């Protein structure tokens, strides 16, 4: 199985056979496959290399934008860089340094609390870096943030879904802006607004278009409710979801097969009135058939994680305060990566 | 009801609507609203109750990736000048690996 895939990769991009020994397939995702390979350096020792084979249905501008994120933003501040890139026709392979890393699920229950602090700090370093360039990653989640516990090394990876802010410094992301473009009624309004009613007027309206590339369980509420003007705040929400998994011991934390089920789960954690209030500020009316109160984050996480030893026995208030700011339902007030690095949770750190 | 398209949503539900009223609302109806399950063992979600795609080059849906990639339309795009934007970025990277000559069979 893996053997035929490797043989086919050498056939697809023949230059690889003169440079790399492809040893194994380490990743299989929606838009790429990633292989472990060994190469010799002209001036250094042998190196392990991650070869990312982009799906050949990818548009060339999308391929180039991913590469440009890696070359311009990557290579420092815990953002993966690129060593080289090989192309034959529609087959593009990005060669990156291989970072040996933990499985998030495997280490979730053995991380010390101090290691959770260090992990979050270094995630925010990476997000501060990409957000400075106006990159909205859109798919912040543990499999896109590689962590080597022993070496204390971190790498944000995978710019295959990224979009640009209006401000972006990644030239090619001006061709993939996060601001949606809408498609192409006898009565504009109807009496169903903010009620449980439906009628022929509202049901027959066109559909709103908004970006939503990403992964189920990590999308911010403004994504789930089809806000056409999304910002780097969606990445900070996703970082909040990672933190919520770390503090609760539960991963994946949310488990939903569609956007409004994900929203219903968020309302069950953060409260329905709180979610409704925030959504009004970005132009969305949410109605739920039952009101549910916000959960206290400390009680929730500690009850789901169970008895704490060592650092886990006395998690500081600052941790749940930072979590509350990351999971801010209002994307305008949600904490930024730059601000998060200044939060008291990170007292006495680098 | 369904014939007149007018009525009320069966509960429980979530309904979302853009406040401009320009767009169709979207709805969620499920049998059970989410329940936080603290009994299920970690690391499980407290909400746990348990080759098709689109070619961006051809602007076409496909049901089998490998089949689409072999189609004549996709091959023509793959072999075109549309990737100059990629090659322009590559030409600024520095190649620092050892490159071997091809091995030719002997005798």
């Amino acid at each position: 199985g893996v053997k035929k895939d490797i043989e086919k990769l050498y056939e697809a991009v023949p230059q690889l056979s003169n440079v790399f020994k492809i040893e194994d397939k380490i990743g299989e995702g929606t838009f790429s496959s990633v292989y472990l390979a060994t190469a010799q350096l002209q001036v250094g020792p042998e190196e392990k290399i991650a070869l990312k084979h982009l799906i050949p249905t990818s548009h060339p501008i999308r391929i180039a934008a991913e590469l440009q994120c890696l070359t311009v933003a990557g290579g420092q501040d815990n953002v993966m860089g690129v060593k080289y890139c090989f192309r034959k026709n529609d087959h593009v392979v990005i060669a990156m340094p291989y970072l040996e890393h933990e499985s998030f699920l495997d280490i979730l229950n053995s991380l010390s609390f101090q290691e959770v602090r260090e992990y979050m700090l270094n995630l925010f370093k990476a997000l501060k870096r990409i957000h400075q360039f106006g990159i909205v990653h859109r798919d912040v989640k543990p499999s896109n943030f590689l962590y080597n516990r022993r070496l204390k090394k971190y790498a944000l990876v995978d710019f295959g879904l990224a979009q640009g802010t209006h401000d972006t410094k990644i030239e090619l992301l001006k061709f993939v802006q996060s601001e949606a473009q809408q498609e192409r009624p006898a009565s504009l309004t109807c009496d169903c607004y903010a009620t449980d009613k439906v009628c022929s007027i509202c049901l027959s309206r066109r559909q709103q278009v908004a970006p939503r590339a990403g992964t189920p369980g990590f999308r911010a509420p403004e994504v789930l409710t089809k806000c056409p003007n999304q910002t780097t705040a969606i990445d900070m929400w996703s970082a909040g979801v990672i933190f919520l998994s770390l503090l609760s011991g539960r991963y994946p934390f949310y488990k939903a097969s569609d956007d409004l089920t994900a929203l219903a789960q968020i309302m069950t954690i953060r409260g329905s009135r709180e979610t409704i209030q925030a959504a009004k500020t970005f132009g969305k009316s949410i109605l739920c058939s039952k009101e549910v109160p916000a959960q206290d984050l400390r009680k929730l996480c500690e009850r789901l994680r169970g008895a704490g030893a060592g650092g886990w026995n006395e998690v500081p208030d600052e941790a749940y305060d930072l979590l509350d700011k990351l999971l801010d339902l209002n994307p305008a007030s949600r904490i930024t990566a730059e601000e998060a690095l200044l939060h008291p949770f990170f007292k006495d750190m680098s | 009801g369904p014939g007149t398209r007018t009525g009320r949503l069966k509960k429980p539900f979530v309904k979302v609507e853009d406040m401009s009223q320009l767009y169709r609302p979207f709805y969620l109806q499920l049998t059970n609203m989410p329940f936080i399950n603290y009994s299920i063992q970690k690391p499980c979600s407290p909400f746990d109750v348990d080759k098709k795609g689109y070619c961006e080059c051809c602007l076409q849906k496909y049901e089998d990736l490998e089949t689409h990639l072999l189609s004549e339309q996709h091959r023509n795009f793959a072999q075109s000048n549309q990737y100059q934007v990629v090659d322009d970025i590559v030409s600024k990277l520095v190649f620092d690996f050892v490159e071997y000559e091809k091995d030719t069979p002997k005798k």
């Binding site: 929606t30 838009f31 548009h59 879904l161 993939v176 970006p211 939503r212 590339a213 992964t215 | 795609g53």
Partner: peptide, 9 residues
């Protein structure tokens, strides 16, 4: 936990 099938452009 893979990405959804669709993305922009």
């Amino acid at each position: 936990l893979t990405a959804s099938p669709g993305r922009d452009l």
